């Protein structure tokens, strides 16, 4: 509590659009979630509000375990677990209602 | 065999928006890139901004963001493109086209929504 | 950005002769550019992919090469039909750029 850890799924192929950034993406996509941290559905008022918040928090606590483990994430990273983060938050919410 | 279907003309006054569709068959709808393509007569083509149909994503030209609204239908096949606050700038043609899966090129083109701008 | 120039802007051809154009990008792109023809009056159509890879139901005639910042698009016998605006565009990075094309046109 207050947030609770959901089971983990399979990683979805994603194009991002562009040459370099699928390529990218394929090459780091390993570094990223595989599961989300949130919190219980009786507390959103929709999808939406409960997917910005899984989004967040779920990087903010995966950017911390990898960082004591030395290394960054960039940008780029950053950008890419939201889009990815966010497509897995939605199965989540979708497995409640 | 794939085909992009678009609307041959749209007349909108000054300051109005249009929405432009795109209908997409003869392939599974959420597997490619949809791109949409600017050209003012006689002159070249401008990239505009692209979505995925999977979930939404959009990628846009810096200049058509906040101009350029791009979205899909996933129940219909279709891509839409939004165009607001209409000058006579924003007369041409736009083009949607497909990609590859994966890929990047662009390898099917719609015939075009001729747009004219005018009171 | 990464700017694509194309050059020449209009070129004069006889038909039969092989012709080529160049499309120059101001980055390395490795092979990320792809050549559309444009008729008057018609939408795009993809000619080669990713530097030279061919496209199913083009003609033959048509080839690309190159890899890097310099491309060029060659016709081995031009018809009359080749007569069109050619444009090449990159999908290494964004925003996707395009070319200002080269024009073809009939020696008379």
């Known amino acids: 509590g207050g947030y609770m850890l959901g089971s983990a799924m399979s990683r979805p192929i994603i194009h991002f659009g562009s040459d370099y950034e699928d390529r990218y993406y394929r090459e780091n996509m390993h570094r990223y979630p595989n599961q989300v941290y949130y919190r219980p559905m009786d507390e959103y008022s929709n999808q939406n509000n409960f997917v910005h918040d899984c989004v967040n928090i779920t990087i903010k606590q995966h950017t911390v375990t990898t960082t004591t483990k030395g290394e960054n994430f960039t940008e780029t990273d950053v950008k890419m677990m939201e889009r990815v983060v966010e497509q897995m938050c939605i199965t989540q919410y979708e497995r409640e209602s | 065999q794939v085909q992009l279907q678009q609307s041959g003309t749209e007349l909108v006054m000054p300051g109005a928006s249009v929405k432009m569709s795109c209908k997409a068959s003869?392939?599974?709808?959420?597997?490619?890139?949809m791109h949409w393509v600017k050209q003012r007569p006689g002159q070249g083509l401008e990239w505009i901004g692209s979505?995925?149909?999977?979930?939404?994503?959009?990628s846009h030209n810096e200049k058509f963001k906040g101009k350029a609204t791009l979205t899909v239908d996933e129940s219909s096949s279709t891509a839409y493109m939004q165009l607001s606050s209409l000058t006579s700038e924003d007369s041409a043609v736009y083009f949607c086209?497909?990609?590859?899966?994966?890929?990047?090129?662009?390898?099917?083109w719609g015939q075009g929504t001729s747009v004219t701008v005018s009171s | 950005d990464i700017v694509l120039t194309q050059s020449p802007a209009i070129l004069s051809v006889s038909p039969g002769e092989r012709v080529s154009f160049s499309c120059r990008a101001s980055?390395?792109?490795?092979?990320?550019i792809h050549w559309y023809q444009q008729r008057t009056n018609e939408s795009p159509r993809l000619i080669i992919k990713?530097?030279?890879e061919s496209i199913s139901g083009i003609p033959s005639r048509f080839s690309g090469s190159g890899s890097g910042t310099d491309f060029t698009l060659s016709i081995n016998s031009v018809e009359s039909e080749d007569i069109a605006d050619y444009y090449c565009?990159?999908?290494?990075?964004?925003?996707?750029?395009f070319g200002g094309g080269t024009k073809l046109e009939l020696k008379r």
């Open positions: 086209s497909r990609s590859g899966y994966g890929y990047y090129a662009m390898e099917y």
């Open positions: 003869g392939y599974t709808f959420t597997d490619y890139w």
């Open positions: 979505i995925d149909p999977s979930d939404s994503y959009t």
């Open positions: 980055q390395n792109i490795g092979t990320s």
């Open positions: 990713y530097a030279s």
């Open positions: 565009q990159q999908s290494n990075t964004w925003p996707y750029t």
